[PDB]
Amino acid sequence: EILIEGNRTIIRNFRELAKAVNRDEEFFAKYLLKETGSAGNLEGGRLILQRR
Secondary structure, three states, X not given: OEEEEOXXXXXXXXXXXXXXXXXXXXXXXXXXXXXXXXXXXXXOOEEEEEXX
């Protein structure tokens, strides 16, 4: 599910992500970041959050 290396973590949240895509999947992963604050990454199928 969630994996962290160095300072960036990728999450295989594709399920939600799929729904998200219809509503801007890209945008969603950003959300994860929004929630945290540090930095975020979005991929068409997986959501990634980058901690502080």
